[PDB]
Structure formats: structure tokens, C-alpha cells
Amino acid sequence: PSHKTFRIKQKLAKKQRQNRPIPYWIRMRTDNTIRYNAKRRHWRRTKLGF
Amino acid sequence: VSLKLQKRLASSVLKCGKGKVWLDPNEVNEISMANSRQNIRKLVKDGFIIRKPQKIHSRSRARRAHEAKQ
Amino acid sequence: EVVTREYTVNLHKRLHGCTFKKKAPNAIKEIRKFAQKAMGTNDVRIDVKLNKHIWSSGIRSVPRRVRVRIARKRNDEEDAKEELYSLVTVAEVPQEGLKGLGTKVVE
Amino acid sequence: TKGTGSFGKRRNKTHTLCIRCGRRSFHLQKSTCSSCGYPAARIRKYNWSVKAIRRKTTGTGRMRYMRHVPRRFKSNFREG
RNA sequence: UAGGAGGGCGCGGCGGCCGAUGCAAAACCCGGGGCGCGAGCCCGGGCGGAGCGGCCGUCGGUGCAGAUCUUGGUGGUAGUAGCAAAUAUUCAAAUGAGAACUUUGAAGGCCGAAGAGGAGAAAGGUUCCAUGUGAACGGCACUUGCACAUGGGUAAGCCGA
RNA sequence: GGUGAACAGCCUCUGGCCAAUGGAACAAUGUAGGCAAGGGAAGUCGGCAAAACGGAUCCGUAACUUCGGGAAAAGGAUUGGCUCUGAGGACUGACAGUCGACUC
RNA sequence: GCGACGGGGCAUUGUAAGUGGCAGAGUGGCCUUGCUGCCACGAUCCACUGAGAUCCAGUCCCCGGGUCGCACGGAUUCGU
RNA sequence: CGACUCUCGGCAACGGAUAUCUCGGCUCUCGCAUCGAUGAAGAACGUAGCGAAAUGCGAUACCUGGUGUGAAUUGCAGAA
Ligand SMILES: [Mg+2]
Ligand SMILES: [Mg+2]
Ligand SMILES: [Mg+2]
Ligand SMILES: [Mg+2]
Ligand SMILES: [Mg+2]
Ligand SMILES: [Mg+2]
Ligand SMILES: [Mg+2]
Ligand SMILES: [Mg+2]
Ligand SMILES: [Mg+2]
Ligand SMILES: [Mg+2]
Ligand SMILES: [Mg+2]
Ligand SMILES: [Mg+2]
Ligand SMILES: [Mg+2]
Ligand SMILES: [Mg+2]
Ligand SMILES: [Mg+2]
Ligand SMILES: [Mg+2]
Ligand SMILES: [Mg+2]
Ligand SMILES: [Mg+2]
Ligand SMILES: [Mg+2]
Ligand SMILES: [Mg+2]
Ligand SMILES: [Mg+2]
Ligand SMILES: [Mg+2]
Ligand SMILES: [Mg+2]
Ligand SMILES: [Mg+2]
Ligand SMILES: [Mg+2]
């Protein structure tokens, strides 16, 4: 809602910083196995439950 | 050359409905370069963007009716 | 080869029995089929005034006859499937009506 | 009816986030966490769910302080 | 048949013996040749690219066709059932590799205001706005988007708490 | 806004849309919606479904009754358009003047 | 010859728009009228008018009556 | 001759069996005894030139200091 608490606004902010594709240079490091962000979230597909 | 950003901001600047905005069909490129409420107001002044007049709903037939019920 | 001719199209017999929500849309299609057979042109362009005429009585009342002129012209546009195109437009008509009008050729 | 018509009426939260454990298990009306038992001083845990125990024992977090006690025990807790 | 016993075949380790292999091991493939009543076995050809086998003793999570068996993969069904509520679209032009589906203009219609209009509470959480975009996704399609990528955006002594 | 007793239904203005995959054709069988001569429930477990009635004004209304009802019982007549006629008012100085939206 | 128009036949509905009317219940105004006055409003009525509109789309006829426009087809295959 | 169906072989797909592995697991044995109001375990939010997760850390924030070692870190860039 537009009326929210600071604590809920704080957690929603962090969830946004985590919806980003991995940097390209991570894919180049020695002995690397990360392919993609396996935790990306879409607001219409998976709800935060908080 | 979609002019969605311009059909909107014409309704808002002219303070009318989006169905009452006329963007000139022969200069879409000048309209398409204006990307601002300032730039839209300039096109308003130049006659490139007008306000279509309201559709007609006359009460003559109601007035004649009420003037025969007397 | 450029030619401009005047036609009367009997839209009544073409649309006889057509569903109401389709008649004036099907009137456009029969104008287009008419011109293709009229000029041997698989490219027919209908003028906006002719479109206005066909829609004037809404979607289910279409003029029973129409006088149009069809003008065969050149695709001067280098990029085109075919050499020629047609321009079908509305045509002014005498006070005698459609009485006695065959296919006239425009000067 | 039950089913689709009745599922449309979820609008009110029975649980919200808990300050002590962070899970959406704080029952607002009852005012206690169903997971950790807050505000009870002791933590809610049972031996009939060993799996729930191991999800939240020591070592599943940082051990901000107890990480270094092994190193301090060696060298018998020297103070400079 | 139920059932009992004997003698064999096969799988994986351990103690011993005897050996093969980058001059090509294992596994797998074959209308290749053979051996054995059979379980199985030996060789040929190919593929592969680094391990493997026989004999004696001993040991075991040791042999599948079934259990509406477990997990995974795959068919026929079948280009089939189907894509049919909420009245509806049409003409030019622009754009573009590509336009029934994008954009502008014109026309024809609908909601008809206890609305298909304008704003909120809950709930959501960036969906808001600009720019761009290969795939996927938007149960046809798309130049497009509530998708994807990069940025931007929420201002209070008086509205609230 | 109009019709109207009416936030009914129906049409319109402000604002919003034409988003529901398209094209061709118009077999059976469906589904949704109509109409049918003569007869009129014979159909069927059963009038199920449909049809008939329906607004308003005037008239008239039985049994029975807890005397409040039944009752909109039942049963009749009327209803457009146009051109008129009468009644019902206000204020200002049994009158004079001006004004006046509405009903019958 | 075909196709499109168009003309005629045949049929359905039921007398179009416009014009005029000393048609019309009545009602206002103005003349020195005087009535068989002049202006204005007026559902409907009358004549022009068995009119007008429609008529194959699965109706009929059209060679002297008419206005037109047409291809010299592309493509695939077959030996008893 | 053909189409379709079935079938044999060769090649190509589909799928991930088999073989060969293994910074993982399981089992046995041994040593030791060390959380917290001096704020623990756990939770949250931050933190890197370029980072989301994991790992690390706390506004001194993928670290400061001492000591040992003795010339790198590394995906790119830069002070060196
Ligand atoms: Mg949902
Ligand atoms: Mg029909
Ligand atoms: Mg229940
Ligand atoms: Mg409730
Ligand atoms: Mg509750
Ligand atoms: Mg074993
Ligand atoms: Mg077993
Ligand atoms: Mg099996
Ligand atoms: Mg068996
Ligand atoms: Mg189908
Ligand atoms: Mg269906
Ligand atoms: Mg209301
Ligand atoms: Mg948007
Ligand atoms: Mg799609
Ligand atoms: Mg009224
Ligand atoms: Mg109403
Ligand atoms: Mg009958
Ligand atoms: Mg009966
Ligand atoms: Mg009977
Ligand atoms: Mg019977
Ligand atoms: Mg019976
Ligand atoms: Mg019934
Ligand atoms: Mg009764
Ligand atoms: Mg007439
Ligand atoms: Mg007549």
C-alpha cells in the first residue's frame, strides 16, 4: 500500500537491489561455475510473503 | 513513428480528453521531435496541435417538446 | 497504360443475404474485387471519400448502387510488386440519376 | 461458496514479520510468534521435529562471537 | 506344478598367482565367424581415448518382465479435441526486413454515467516514466509490451501516522 | 440530457474504448433467439418449457374473516396527433397592472 | 461470345419528394374591407401520382437501339 | 512402375544409459574441553573502481594493527 512502515519499506528496497543479472566479468573468472542469477524474482510470478 | 508520448501531454496540457486532441497528420516528424510539455505547448501555439470541438448535443428538440407541453 | 473510366456498381446483388455486422465491410471487399476484374489490377486503392460514402448509413445499410470512377495509373514507386495500381473514387452524378448510365470513359 | 469464491477474500494478515526470528510467523492478535515463541524468553523448539531444530541451531548463522573462541582457547585466552 | 538337493554360469571387492594395454584399455555398435543342451563365452570389424582381464581361496547392498512398482526419458492418440460470452470494425498514409494486430487522420459503433469514466482503503512492490532490445514470454502475430536491459522518479509545522 | 413515477429499460454529451486470433463458406447435429394454418394439454409422472396477463384513468368487485383483511379479487370501458376551452396562483399599487413554472 | 452497366418484361409495397390548393377542426394579428378581405399558425386531405422505391443475388428477354471491357492464357502431367 | 503400412541395413536425430572419475558422503578409532548482561546463539540492514548470490566484514565495513613469510593480486582497470 501507499501507507507502509519503514521496516517494510527497508526490506522492499533490498529485494530490488537483488533483482539484477550477474556482472559479465564474473563469467570470466578462473574456476567459475555461475551461469545466471538463479534467484531472480518477478513481482507477478513469486510473491515475497511479507 | 508512434506519438503516444505526444497524444498524452496534449490531453494534459490542453486539459481535455484524449479523444479531443488533434495532432496534424502531415507533420508527424515535428510532433515526434517534441518530447516535453514545453515543446507541446509550442506546437499548440503554432496550430500543429489543436483541440477538437465538443460533439453536438442540442436541446432544441427537448425545448420544442417542453414548449408544446405548455 | 493509363485509363480512367466511370462505373455503376450494383452492390445490392453482391451483398444480398450478408450478415449485418459484415455488410459494409463486405461492401469494401466487393468494390476491391470489382476493380481487380475491371482493370486487371491485383492492386486496388479505395479513396477515403469512397469509404465515407459506403459507411454513411452505418454498418448494415449500404448504398444499393454506386457510381465510381476507376483510374488505372503507374506504380512510379520503383519498389513495387506490380507495374500499375488502381484508384477507385466516388463520382459526381447527374440529376437524371442513374437512369441510362452505362460505363463511360473519362476524357 | 468454498473454493474460488471464498479465496477471493484474503485481505487481512494473520501473521507478519517477527523481530526476533525474521519469519512471517508473528500472530498479531495472539501476539506471539508461531516459529520462535517470541515474546517468550526461551525459544520454541521441539524434539518431535529434529528437522526444524537443524534449520535454526548454532552454526546456521554467522557465529559472530563464538567463531573465535576456538582460536582463543588455543593460546589460553591471552590478553595483550 | 508345490517343494528339496547337486553341478555349473554371471556381477563387485579382498588375499594370492598369471597377464593384456597409446603398435590403442573399458563401455558401446554390427546382415561378421565360432563354441556350449543352456546360463554364457571366445574371436573379427568399427567407435573410443586410459585403463582392464583370467585362475585358486574367500567375501557380498550379486542376476528382473511384471509389484495400479520408484525415478527419468519416449511413443500412438494427433497436426486431432480445440482457439466461438462481454454488438465492430473500415479507408488512406507513416513506419518497418516483415503490418489484419504499432502510430496519425477520417468514418462507423459501444460503455451511457449504481460507467467499460475520475479517485481511494486493503493487498501488491517498482508494475510508474524515458531510452533501447537477440532469444524466451505476451496459448495467432507484433516494429510491440504490465516482458527483457540500462537509467530516472515519491520533497509536508498545516494530508496522515 | 431525453423518455418516464423512477439511480427501471432504451438513446445521447464529458471521459474511455473497439482489448477478446484472422480468412472462406453457410451441410447434418448442436447451443442461444423467433414465427407458425386447423385443433388446444390429446403430450407428459406432472402444463416442464413457452404463450397468455401486464402501465395509467374511470367503474365495479363474491365466499370467508381474528372485522385488520381477502382486493390490484373477479368483471368492464378508455389510451395517438392536432386545434381549442375551463379551473387551480404570485407580487405591486370584490380593482388595475405585470409575472409565472406546473397539474387536472 | 462472355462480363459489367443500362432498357424492357415480371413481381412486392401502396400513392414518393416537390409544387399548388377559394380542402381543413379551429386560433392570433391588421385593414376605411364589406362579404365570397389580407397576413400568420395548423394533425390531416386533394391533384400532379396505380405514384415512388425495389426487383436475381438461384427470375425472363436484349444482333439495331445503346455505353463499355475483355484473352491471344499461365502451370502440372499422361504411351495403349 | 508409384502412394500407404510393416520390415532389414547404412547414415543422421532424440535422450542421457554405460564406462572411466571425484576438494563429496557414510562408518570406525583417537585427542581435547572452549557460549552468555564484559550482551551469546539467532535475526536485520549495510559494506568492493567495476557484485546479485555464496564467503567475509561493520560507518576503521571482501578490512585496520602486530608477527611470520618473502614478491605478488588477477575477470578488467589503476596506484604501483
Ligand atoms: Mg496473482
Ligand atoms: Mg437468409
Ligand atoms: Mg471447508
Ligand atoms: Mg470479510
Ligand atoms: Mg484474526
Ligand atoms: Mg558392496
Ligand atoms: Mg538387491
Ligand atoms: Mg525393466
Ligand atoms: Mg516373473
Ligand atoms: Mg482443429
Ligand atoms: Mg468452446
Ligand atoms: Mg451513488
Ligand atoms: Mg509503462
Ligand atoms: Mg505467441
Ligand atoms: Mg417528467
Ligand atoms: Mg434512468
Ligand atoms: Mg398454431
Ligand atoms: Mg395434460
Ligand atoms: Mg393426459
Ligand atoms: Mg398418453
Ligand atoms: Mg397420470
Ligand atoms: Mg412454467
Ligand atoms: Mg382469492
Ligand atoms: Mg407526393
Ligand atoms: Mg395517387
Side-chain angles (χ1 to χ4, degrees):
Chain A
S2 282
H3 295 148
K4 49 183 71 74
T5 51
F6 174 86
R7 203 194 315 259
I8 296 299
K9 184 168 170 190
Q10 202 175 27
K11 304 188 71 66
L12 288 175
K14 182 177 184 177
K15 276 287 179 179
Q16 288 175 18
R17 187 175 72 254
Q18 287 176 324
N19 268 352
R20 67 156 290 169
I22 73 164
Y24 64 92
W25 46 276
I26 290 274
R27 215 81 63 62
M28 327 286 280
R29 305 178 307 171
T30 64
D31 291 331
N32 172 75
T33 187
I34 305 179
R35 316 273 206 90
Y36 40 77
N37 187 353
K39 288 178 175 173
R40 298 282 308 278
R41 175 191 52 91
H42 193 240
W43 59 276
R44 208 159 197 165
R45 292 184 291 113
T46 295
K47 293 298 177 180
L48 300 166
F50 78 74
Chain B
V1 194
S2 173
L3 306 168
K4 291 174 70 175
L5 174 57
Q6 285 82 14
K7 182 63 66 68
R8 170 186 91 89
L9 282 71
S11 314
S12 199
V13 166
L14 282 71
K15 299 168 65 187
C16 66
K18 198 164 41 185
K20 289 303 199 312
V21 165
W22 186 82
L23 312 174
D24 189 336
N26 298 348
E27 293 83 3
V28 298
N29 289 318
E30 293 293 328
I31 314 290
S32 179
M33 294 183 286
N35 68 341
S36 173
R37 316 182 69 93
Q38 175 180 6
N39 284 356
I40 293 290
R41 282 188 297 262
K42 187 75 180 295
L43 285 166
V44 176
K45 182 180 169 291
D46 291 331
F48 267 71
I49 298 189
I50 63 170
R51 186 177 209 200
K52 285 185 295 202
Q54 183 197 305
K55 294 201 289 198
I56 292 275
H57 194 202
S58 60
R59 285 178 39 77
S60 67
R61 179 185 325 91
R63 270 185 218 120
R64 276 136 55 199
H66 170 288
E67 277 190 289
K69 295 196 187 184
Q70 65 182 357
Chain C
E1 184 188 2
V2 298
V3 192
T4 304
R5 291 189 295 271
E6 295 294 328
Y7 284 88
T8 302
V9 184
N10 182 339
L11 288 170
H12 196 212
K13 75 166 71 171
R14 295 171 199 280
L15 301 169
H16 178 260
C18 168
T19 296
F20 279 163
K21 298 293 183 182
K22 298 296 289 183
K23 291 178 71 68
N26 283 348
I28 300 299
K29 292 173 178 173
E30 307 281 359
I31 301 299
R32 194 180 326 270
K33 292 181 181 179
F34 181 90
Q36 295 174 352
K37 176 197 46 73
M39 297 278 188
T41 60
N42 50 355
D43 183 23
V44 176
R45 304 164 195 174
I46 298 173
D47 187 74
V48 188
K49 293 182 183 293
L50 184 51
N51 186 62
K52 196 167 172 263
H53 178 80
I54 297 178
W55 280 85
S56 296
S57 293
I59 196 174
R60 68 184 68 187
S61 296
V62 179
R64 287 178 182 146
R65 298 169 163 61
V66 183
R67 192 75 175 174
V68 301
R69 77 159 85 204
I70 298 169
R72 199 163 42 190
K73 292 181 181 180
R74 305 257 182 220
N75 277 0
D76 290 331
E77 293 301 343
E78 65 183 1
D79 45 345
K81 296 183 290 294
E82 182 64 26
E83 283 284 356
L84 294 187
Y85 68 95
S86 312
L87 194 59
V88 185
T89 70
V90 65
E92 65 182 1
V93 65
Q95 307 295 336
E96 303 168 354
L98 298 183
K99 181 64 70 178
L101 297 184
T103 306
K104 274 150 163 203
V105 180
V106 176
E107 186 180 4
Chain D
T1 80
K2 45 165 173 284
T4 310
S6 285
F7 300 142
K9 281 142 73 83
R10 283 85 170 94
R11 229 180 72 198
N12 304 298
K13 296 163 176 282
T14 288
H15 295 106
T16 188
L17 297 178
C18 171
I19 63 170
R20 195 206 274 158
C21 70
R23 277 184 63 91
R24 198 255 296 267
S25 313
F26 198 69
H27 196 288
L28 294 174
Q29 293 187 246
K30 291 203 284 197
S31 293
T32 66
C33 184
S34 63
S35 191
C36 54
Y38 178 82
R42 283 170 190 121
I43 288 175
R44 175 189 172 283
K45 67 184 289 184
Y46 293 108
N47 299 302
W48 50 258
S49 185
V50 303
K51 192 174 300 192
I53 283 180
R54 65 183 180 180
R55 290 192 191 100
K56 73 179 179 179
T57 61
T58 306
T60 67
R62 292 172 71 175
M63 294 183 286
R64 208 170 195 175
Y65 171 84
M66 278 166 90
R67 178 193 316 241
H68 315 289
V69 180
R71 179 218 315 128
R72 304 165 56 212
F73 167 75
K74 185 183 286 185
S75 66
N76 47 68
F77 297 101
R78 66 177 65 89
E79 296 296 78

